Amino acid sequence: MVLYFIGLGLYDERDITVKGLEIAKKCDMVFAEFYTSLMAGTTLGRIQKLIGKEIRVLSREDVELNFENIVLPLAKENDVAFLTPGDPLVATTHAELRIRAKRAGVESYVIHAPSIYSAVGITGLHIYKFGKSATVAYPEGNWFPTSYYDVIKENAERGLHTLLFLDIKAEKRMYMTANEAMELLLKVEDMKKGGVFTDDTLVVVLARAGSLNPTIRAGYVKDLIREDFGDPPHILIVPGKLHIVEAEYLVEIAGAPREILRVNV
């Protein structure tokens, strides 16, 4: 009689919470989407094995246009689960699906899972110091998205770090790298010339958070822009003014140049 939004986590099938697993195991039917993010350390097969259920994967069109036609109808007579990577309601539009559920007379419940949005804490940057977040979208045709640039500018002026979700085209199997995001930002810099992102700008890259050996690197764009950070997914962070302990972590754990230890107060 109910619908469950259950997050699967950051990297592999085991990043689901015990709560999430126990509930999914007792659902009559399980649905899922794998276009909002990329779980690089697992396969649908492994998720199905762990949950002991067959999972019907939905596309963005299935969800965005027919969620109330494919999923909700079954709720009235079943306990249904809808699985998604990371946390189901973070940097997605899935929250709106709950409204669709309500209007359809279906109760819904949300089971959280580790999200890239808080996992950035592994970079050593104070979570509270993060300001507005943004997404670096692939330019398409004559349309070249550039709003994320201004977001970085506003946060920096306030001494806040900027979290940059990188773009994804799940059906084309394209996952934007930190390198590609940097290239786009350098280009937007030439455009606006606001001195927001250049060769000397310090950045932090977090790749495959959730795995046991994520790639955590910090340095100047000029040096990291052509560095190999491994397989996707990637996230890119542009730090604001650094606290001393933040810098120490970047140097000790993320291999940043020792010179950032010298914070300019």
Which residues in this chain contact ligand SAH in the complex, by CB under 6 A?
A: 10-11, 36-37, 85-87, 90-92, 115-117, 165-166, 168, 206-210, 233-235
Residue 166 annotated as binding?
Answer: yes
CB of 185 to a second copy, least distance (A): 17
The structure tokens listed for 161 are: 């770090």
Closest CA to 35 of 56, 60, 10: 60
Q: How far apart are CA 205 and CA 219, in angstroms?
A: 9
Pick from a second copy, ligand SAH, none: which does 37 bind, CB < 5 to 8 A by kind? ligand SAH
Residue 178 annotated as binding?
Answer: no
From residue 226, alpha-carbon distances to 10, 180, 232, 262 in Å are: 25, 9, 15, 25
Q: Which residue is nearest to ligand SAH (CB)?
A: 86
**Residues of 28-42 as b/e, b for ≥16 C-beta within 10 angstroms?**
ebbbbbbbbbbbbbb
The residues binding a second copy (CB under 8 A) are 7, 9-10, 12-19, 21-22, 50, 86-96, 98-99, 102-103, 109-115, 117-119, 121-122, 124, 126-135, 154, 158, 160, 165, 209-210, 212-213, 245, 248-249, 252-253
Residue 156 annotated as binding?
Answer: no
Residue 90 annotated as binding?
Answer: yes
Q: Which residue's CB is nearer to ligand SAH, number 103 or number 126?
A: 126
Q: Which residue's CB is nearer to a second copy, number 13 or number 189?
A: 13
| Count of Cβ atoms closer than 10 Å to residue 235 Cβ | 23
Pick from a second copy, ligand SAH, none: which does 49 bind, CB < 5 to 8 A by kind? none
167 alpha-carbon distance from chain centroid: 9
The structure tokens listed for 203 are: 């950045």
